[PDB]
Amino acid sequence: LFQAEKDRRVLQMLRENLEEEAIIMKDVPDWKVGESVFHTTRWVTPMMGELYGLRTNEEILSATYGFIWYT
Amino acid sequence: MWFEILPGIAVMAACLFIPGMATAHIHKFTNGGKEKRVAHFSYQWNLMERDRRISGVNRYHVTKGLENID
Amino acid sequence: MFMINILSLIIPILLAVAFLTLVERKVLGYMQLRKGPNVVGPYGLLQPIADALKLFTKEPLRPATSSISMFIIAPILALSLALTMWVPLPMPYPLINMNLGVLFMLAMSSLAVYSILWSGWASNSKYALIGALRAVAQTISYEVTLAIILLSVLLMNGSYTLSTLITTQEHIWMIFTSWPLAMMWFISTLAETNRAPFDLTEGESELVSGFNVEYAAGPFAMFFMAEYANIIMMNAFTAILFLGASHDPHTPELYTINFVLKTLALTITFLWIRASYPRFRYDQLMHLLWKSFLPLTLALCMWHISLPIMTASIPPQS
Amino acid sequence: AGRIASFLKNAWAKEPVLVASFAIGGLAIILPSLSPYTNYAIRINRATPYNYPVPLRDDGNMPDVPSHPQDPQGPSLEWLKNL
Amino acid sequence: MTMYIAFILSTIFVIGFVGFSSKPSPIYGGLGLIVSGGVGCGIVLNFGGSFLGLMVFLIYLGGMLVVFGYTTAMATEMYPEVWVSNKTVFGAFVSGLMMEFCMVYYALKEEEVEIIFKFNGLGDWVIYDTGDSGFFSEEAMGIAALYSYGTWLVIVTGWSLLIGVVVIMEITRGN
Amino acid sequence: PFFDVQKRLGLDLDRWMTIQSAEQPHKIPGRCHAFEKEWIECAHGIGGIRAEKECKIEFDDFVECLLRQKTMKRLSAIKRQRDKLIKEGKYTPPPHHLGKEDPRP
Amino acid sequence: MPLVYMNIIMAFAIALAGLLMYRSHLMSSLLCLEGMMLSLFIMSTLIILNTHFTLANMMPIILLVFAACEAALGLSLLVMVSNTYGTDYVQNLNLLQC
Amino acid sequence: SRGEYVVAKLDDLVNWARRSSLWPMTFGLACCAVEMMHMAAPRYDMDRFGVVFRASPRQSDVMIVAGTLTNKMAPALRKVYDQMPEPRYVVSMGSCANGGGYYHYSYSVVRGCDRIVPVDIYVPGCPPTAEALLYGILQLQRKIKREKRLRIWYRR
Amino acid sequence: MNIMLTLLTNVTLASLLVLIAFWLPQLNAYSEKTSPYECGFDPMGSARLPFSMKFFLVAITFLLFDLEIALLLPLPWASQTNNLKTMLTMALFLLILLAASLAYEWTQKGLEWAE
Ligand SMILES: COC1=C(OC)C(=O)C(C/C=C(\C)CC/C=C(\C)CC/C=C(/C)CC/C=C(/C)CC/C=C(/C)CC/C=C(\C)CC/C=C(\C)CC/C=C(/C)CC/C=C(/C)CCC=C(C)C)=C(C)C1=O
Ligand SMILES: CCCCCCCCCCCCCCCCC[C@@H](O)O[C@H](CO[C@H](O)CCCCCCCCCCCCCCC)COP(=O)(O)OCC[N+](C)(C)C
Ligand SMILES: CCCCCCCCCCCCCCCCC[C@@H](O)O[C@H](CO[C@H](O)CCCCCCCCCCCCCCC)COP(=O)(O)OCC[N+](C)(C)C
Ligand SMILES: CCCCCCCCCCCCCCCCC[C@@H](O)O[C@H](CO[C@H](O)CCCCCCCCCCCCCCC)COP(=O)(O)OCC[N+](C)(C)C
Ligand SMILES: CCCCCCCCCCCCCCCCC[C@@H](O)O[C@H](CO[C@H](O)CCCCCCCCCCCCCCC)COP(=O)(O)OCC[N+](C)(C)C
Ligand SMILES: CCCCCCCC/C=C\CCCCCCCC(=O)O[C@H](COC(=O)CCCCCCC/C=C/CCCCCCCC)COP(=O)(O)OCCN
Numbered sequence A: 001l002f003q004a005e006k007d008r009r010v011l012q013m014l015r016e017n018l019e020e021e022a023i024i025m026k027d028v029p030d031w032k033v034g035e036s037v038f039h040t041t042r043w044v045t046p047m048m049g050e051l052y053g054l055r056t057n058e059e060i061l062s063a064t065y066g067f068i069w070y071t
Numbered sequence B: 001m002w003f004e005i006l007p008g009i010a011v012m013a014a015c016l017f018i019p020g021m022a023t024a025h026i027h028k029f030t031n032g033g034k035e036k037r038v039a040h041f042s043y044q045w046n047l048m049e050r051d052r053r054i055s056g057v058n059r060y061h062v063t064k065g066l067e068n069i070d
Numbered sequence C: 001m002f003m004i005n006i007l008s009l010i011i012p013i014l015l016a017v018a019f020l021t022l023v024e025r026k027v028l029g030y031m032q033l034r035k036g037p038n039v040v041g042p043y044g045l046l047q048p049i050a051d052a053l054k055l056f057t058k059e060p061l062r063p064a065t066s067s068i069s070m071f072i073i074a075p076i077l078a079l080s081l082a083l084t085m086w087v088p089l090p091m092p093y094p095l096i097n098m099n100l101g102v103l104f105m106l107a108m109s110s111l112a113v114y115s116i117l118w119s120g121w122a123s124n125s126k127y128a129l130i131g132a133l134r135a136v137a138q139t140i141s142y143e144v145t146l147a148i149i150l151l152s153v154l155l156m157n158g159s160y161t162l163s164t165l166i167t168t169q170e171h172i173w174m175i176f177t178s179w180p181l182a183m184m185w186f187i188s189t190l191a192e193t194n195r196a197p198f199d200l201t202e203g204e205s206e207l208v209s210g211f212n213v214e215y216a217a218g219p220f221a222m223f224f225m226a227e228y229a230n231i232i233m234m235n236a237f238t239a240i241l242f243l244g245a246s247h248d249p250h251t252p253e254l255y256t257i258n259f260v261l262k263t264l265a266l267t268i269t270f271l272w273i274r275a276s277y278p279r280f281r282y283d284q285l286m287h288l289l290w291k292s293f294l295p296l297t298l299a300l301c302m303w304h305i306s307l308p309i310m311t312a313s314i315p316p317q318s
Numbered sequence D: 001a002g003r004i005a006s007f008l009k010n011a012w013a014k015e016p017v018l019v020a021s022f023a024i025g026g027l028a029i030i031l032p033s034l035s036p037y038t039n040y041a042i043r044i045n046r047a048t049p050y051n052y053p054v055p056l057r058d059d060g061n062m063p064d065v066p067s068h069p070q071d072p073q074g075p076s077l078e079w080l081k082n083l
Numbered sequence E: 001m002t003m004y005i006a007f008i009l010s011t012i013f014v015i016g017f018v019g020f021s022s023k024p025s026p027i028y029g030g031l032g033l034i035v036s037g038g039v040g041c042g043i044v045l046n047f048g049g050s051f052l053g054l055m056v057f058l059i060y061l062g063g064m065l066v067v068f069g070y071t072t073a074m075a076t077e078m079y080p081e082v083w084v085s086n087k088t089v090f091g092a093f094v095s096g097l098m099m100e101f102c103m104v105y106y107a108l109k110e111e112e113v114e115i116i117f118k119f120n121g122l123g124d125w126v127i128y129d130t131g132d133s134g135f136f137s138e139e140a141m142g143i144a145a146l147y148s149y150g151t152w153l154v155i156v157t158g159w160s161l162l163i164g165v166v167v168i169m170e171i172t173r174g175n
Numbered sequence F: 001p002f003f004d005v006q007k008r009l010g011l012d013l014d015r016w017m018t019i020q021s022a023e024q025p026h027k028i029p030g031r032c033h034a035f036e037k038e039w040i041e042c043a044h045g046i047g048g049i050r051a052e053k054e055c056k057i058e059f060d061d062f063v064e065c066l067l068r069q070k071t072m073k074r075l076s077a078i079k080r081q082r083d084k085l086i087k088e089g090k091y092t093p094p095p096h097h098l099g100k101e102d103p104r105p
Numbered sequence G: 001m002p003l004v005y006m007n008i009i010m011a012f013a014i015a016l017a018g019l020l021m022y023r024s025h026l027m028s029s030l031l032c033l034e035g036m037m038l039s040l041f042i043m044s045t046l047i048i049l050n051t052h053f054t055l056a057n058m059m060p061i062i063l064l065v066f067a068a069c070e071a072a073l074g075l076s077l078l079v080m081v082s083n084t085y086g087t088d089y090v091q092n093l094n095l096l097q098c
Numbered sequence H: 001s002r003g004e005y006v007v008a009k010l011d012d013l014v015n016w017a018r019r020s021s022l023w024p025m026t027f028g029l030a031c032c033a034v035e036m037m038h039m040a041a042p043r044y045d046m047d048r049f050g051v052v053f054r055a056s057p058r059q060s061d062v063m064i065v066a067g068t069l070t071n072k073m074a075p076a077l078r079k080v081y082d083q084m085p086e087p088r089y090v091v092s093m094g095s096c097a098n099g100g101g102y103y104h105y106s107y108s109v110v111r112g113c114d115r116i117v118p119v120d121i122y123v124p125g126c127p128p129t130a131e132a133l134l135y136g137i138l139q140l141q142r143k144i145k146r147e148k149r150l151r152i153w154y155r156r
Numbered sequence I: 001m002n003i004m005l006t007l008l009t010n011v012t013l014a015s016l017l018v019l020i021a022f023w024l025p026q027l028n029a030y031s032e033k034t035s036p037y038e039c040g041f042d043p044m045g046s047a048r049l050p051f052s053m054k055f056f057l058v059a060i061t062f063l064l065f066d067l068e069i070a071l072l073l074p075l076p077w078a079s080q081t082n083n084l085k086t087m088l089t090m091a092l093f094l095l096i097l098l099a100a101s102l103a104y105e106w107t108q109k110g111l112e113w114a115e
């Protein structure tokens, strides 16, 4: 159940980021929205810079340093 | 005594009483009164984050029972 | 609300140190067929307050030849380490729940001696230098034995988390399993905190107060506070490691009371040993630790590695 | 086998710490080989499920693979409950 | 952007390296190396390296103490030097600090390449993997695998330590 | 030079640690397991000289997984344009990117 | 590459220059060597942790071990130098020329 | 007024703190040092009054001149008195330290320690009994109690 | 974060104590007062002169021994491997090597201090 919820959450965050990038990148002349950086076409796990890239600082802090700093 | 040393020792004991219980009380007062969760590994942290997300109030200790699934 | 916890852990420890000074003075007096301080307050209860107020209202002195920055930094480092090494202790809930508490304690304890070293070097006096060298010899003698003893004891715990020591000995004290290691660890902690018969870094009869001979009023008081806080903290760590108490999750006050009583008993034992024996020699201490403690420690480390595999009793929490 | 007894006597009379340490080390070296409980420790270590057991795709030729956790097939930890 | 904790720690690391690398009377060099070791322990703590950081801190502290005793015995002078007691030491310290600050400014403002490759910046929080772990610790298992997988490493390490004891004894034999 | 005795005797003295995807304890995978495995399978057998020309795609993907230089460049460009737009005043980021998101388990 | 890696590389380069400068003493150069070991250790463990190379986590520790040996070796030599001159100054090591 | 009350109370507190805990420096010269030792004996137990010996001059409050002060020693006594941080007090014990005593006319005896250091309390005897020295210490405590530093500073 | 806050609080408290100790009392320092402390007279040499170390060899051996504990500390986690025989053999081998090195120092009069 946790695996299913994690997959859905990651996919939702990626879709939200892609939609927002499509909105922002509209006036850029030579930009392709949602373009992969890998020559392959399989699934590559996100980097956490791609999930919480456009979000606030508190969410980023909880995402990256949340577990290590919890004591 | 020889028992005249007992007062001072007692006072010292009182001082050593103060931290421990206080910490416990603080933990309870900060976590709904139920022994603040321990997250030694990543799985327990993930569980805590899931509880915080589904709580609806941004507090991991606000647990939801069977009444939250209709 | 965390700062409240920090203050509630800091202030009572300092008060306990202040009253431990009076308790030690009275205990030594009564073991020396006299009374000890009983004049300043009722049964001498106000003596530490008068001592502290006198020390902090007295002129602080800095030597002309002394290196200033180290001379001032050393007491700050000593007191800060003494106060910091209290957080990971479970009583029964630690303030900071570290995954590796024992290693953190070892590293901070190793860093603590640098306060003594730097104070002795910056004082720029011969007695202070001799005291610093004696401290170096002492730590060289005891460090490896202390670390191996800790590892051998924790081999039956399964991890370095201090909270797991509470549930490891839920049924039986760990002193009934490793009492030779218990005795060796007790001697090692006696040598670690610079206490009699291993109080060579001060050497009142030999080095006229030793490394802190040049610290007049305030920093000397801070050094005294750091030493006594280290004494109490090491005794509490020994009590938790070897004499585990029963912890009921719905009433931690019972565990707190038991742990405090055990710590006080160990501290009184420390004062007893100080009053009972003469002083070692700083080469004889090294010879004792390297010719009598290291072989037994290595043998018991091998034994405690083999025993869980031999009897199929490996602890959980890989 | 006669002079070794005298040497042990002298070592015990003069340096008992070395004798005790050597005896403990030797016991720790030899005893685990003869102990029948080492295999039990290894089995207990192997029985700890740190990671998820991935199910196998059924090709119709797996008689020893259970179709459900409560099926009688597969490894059993009944020996552990009695230890 | 995220409190620059790792960046601040790295800057303090480099500052301590500059402090002890200008060779100011090894007592202060030892202090600088202790500061650098502690800050590096913190840096690797921030990345999940608990055991490794604590081990390097302890090993260095023990090592530094031996060094302090040795400089007191053999490497002391009547007027020990400090970062402001000599023109050369101060010059080296200031040059190191200034060049570190210049590199930091150039990397933060621009994607400048100095020696290896171009600079990115934008904090080091980005590279952290989103993958989760189990009930075990990845570093703890990797280190503990030394006794089951690294038999060869253990053998060569033990032989090297024994030979090192013999070697220091032979060197300090004298004659 | 390289007196290879491991292959002669079949000892495996230090080959268990050479690559990232070779029997880690508890089956813990590397961050770039798939890319490294793909590159290794591509480059095995042809030789060193051919592996730098025919398996260049796999090596490039593996390096990109290792260092993520292209990903960080893309993210920095997106963030730069985003901050320029917010300074100009046409973006108005959505609530779920500001802290008003409805979280899901 | 993030700023942390470049800062560690800068620390290693600074320590290398400090070792190669040889001001007056011999203890200071040994301290520079140990600083180089420390920077190597920190960079290696950062790289290992970033890529989740599990089996390589034991690599830094072995590093540290040999570092100790090196340190010990240097200290031994220093003692002899002192016992020949009463001072660890490098200016005294000039009996052999090129 | 209000300030006068505050300074009086603060001065009383500081005087009590300094009086209750006096730390004499371990410093004896001659016969009178044996009686100084006997003051620390279980019968009298000066420690119970807060008076405990400390070796280093930097951590000392009171200097008790117990014994004859010869010409060879006078620079050392002045040196160890100078190194005591203020406030510091001197108690002169015995006739030898008071005014020379039995060796007043000798060629190598300083006729009283008051020529070298300022003295607060003079304890007479040869040697003064441990009770006499305890009484002198209590008189020094009373003298410290009578002192008024902050009150004088306020009226400046 | 919590550990950093604890360290900052402790350091601030110690610094405040030092500041109060150095600024509250009346300071009257003259040249004779701040002189170096010998027992009663002036020091002959200097405290910065070389101070002979009679246990240098023991110090170097401590340097080498301090890494044995670093190698041996992951044993509680190494106890959880599947093949316990190899782990036990390697741990015992390392401890035997440490004991052998200590014995070799002992017999060759390496632990005795210099005269
Ligand atoms: C015959 O031939 C001769 C000799 O041959 C024998 C001689 O020898 C000789 C020279 C000898 C003479 C000079 C006489 C010497 C006397 C004897 C030899 C010995 C007499 C006594 C000895 C020294 C033995 C003493 C031992 C006892 C057990 C006494 C106890 C020992 C103490 C040192 C231990 C206690 C330590 C002190 C009391 C200091 C403790 C005080 C603290 C530092 C203060 C508390 C800490 C605070 C800072 C806490 C602050 C925290 C706060 C929060 C608290 C609250 C404060 C707020 C305001 C609320 C002569 C002259 C001689 O002719
Ligand atoms: C959250 C709870 C934590 C508890 C922690 C454990 C216990 C800590 C308490 C420590 C006990 C200290 C011993 C007190 C013994 C009683 C002393 C009392 O009987 O004597 C009185 C002492 O009175 C003092 O005022 C009491 C001081 C005790 C508190 C000091 C402890 C330090 C911590 C807090 C300091 C704040 C001090 C505030 C009051 C001045 C008599 O003095 P006084 O009545 O005057 O007479 C002289 C004035 N005349 C001449 C006009 C008559
Ligand atoms: C940092 C927080 C604390 C700050 C400082 C407070 C420390 C705690 C205060 C301690 C209180 C105890 C002081 C007095 C105890 C009573 C003892 C009484 O007997 O003293 C008498 C009188 O003492 C003084 O009159 C009392 C002094 C107390 C002054 C009150 C000040 C309150 C503290 C205010 C601090 C901050 C003020 C606000 C501005 C910032 C004289 O007795 P004495 O002759 O010797 O001994 C008799 C000997 N015998 C037994 C043999 C016969
Ligand atoms: C227990 C832990 C918690 C404690 C919490 C409280 C923390 C207390 C902080 C520590 C300081 C208290 C010490 C008490 C005395 C103050 C020391 C110093 O700050 O005062 C004077 C510092 O002042 C300087 O002399 C000159 C000051 C002129 C510059 C003014 C400061 C800038 C403000 C601008 C003026 C505007 C109005 C100021 C009032 C708001 C020292 O002068 P100095 O003679 O050397 O030293 C002798 C002090 N004696 C007399 C007490 C022995
Ligand atoms: C063959 C050449 C002989 C002449 C050359 C001699 C010089 C070299 C010294 C000895 C060579 C070391 C060879 C050991 C290679 C390790 C591989 C093999 O031995 O199996 C190991 C078994 O090791 C055994 O314990 C035996 C090795 C113990 C060696 C005893 C030490 C004495 C060596 C002599 C030199 C040391 C210094 C001097 C000592 C006096 C582990 O197997 P296993 O665990 O299933 O698989 C691990 C992988 N898993 C976890 C995925 C399953
Ligand atoms: C069936 C398989 C079982 C396997 C074996 C397991 C059992 C092992 C049996 C042997 C155990 C012996 C343990 C002894 C520990 C070592 C002590 C030692 O040998 O050193 C002493 C020295 O010890 C000391 O002198 C230390 C003095 C310090 C005194 C401190 C206070 C006295 C004791 C206080 C109470 C002790 C409390 C211990 C527990 C505290 C609670 C944790 C001898 O040295 P020397 O006499 O100098 O001889 C060398 C020259 N020939």
Ligand SMILES: CCCCCCCC/C=C\CCCCCCCC(=O)O[C@H](COC(=O)CCCCCCC/C=C/CCCCCCCC)COP(=O)(O)OCCN
Pocket (backbone or CB within 6 Å): C291, C294, C295, C296, C298, C299, D011, D014, D015, D018, D019, D020, D021, D022, D023, D024, D025, D026, D029, I096, I099, I100, I102, I103, I106, I107
């Ligand atoms: C391969 C098996 C190894 C496993 C067991 C060992 C594990 C670790 C224990 C050993 C630690 C290192 C020991 C170092 C030995 C040094 C010996 C030495 O040279 O010291 C002699 C002293 O030692 C001796 O007397 C010579 C050897 C004494 C006997 C040593 C052990 C012999 C066998 C004992 C156990 C036998 C088997 C157990 C039987 C138990 C009874 C049934 C010199 O005397 P000093 O103290 O330096 O100076 C005295 C003058 N001031």
Ligand code: SF4
Pocket (backbone or CB within 6 Å): H030, H031, H032, H066, H067, H068, H093, H094, H095, H096, H097, H101, H102, H125, H126, H127, H128
């Ligand atoms: S006064 Fe009398 S007893 Fe005291 S030192 Fe002089 S001669 Fe001796």
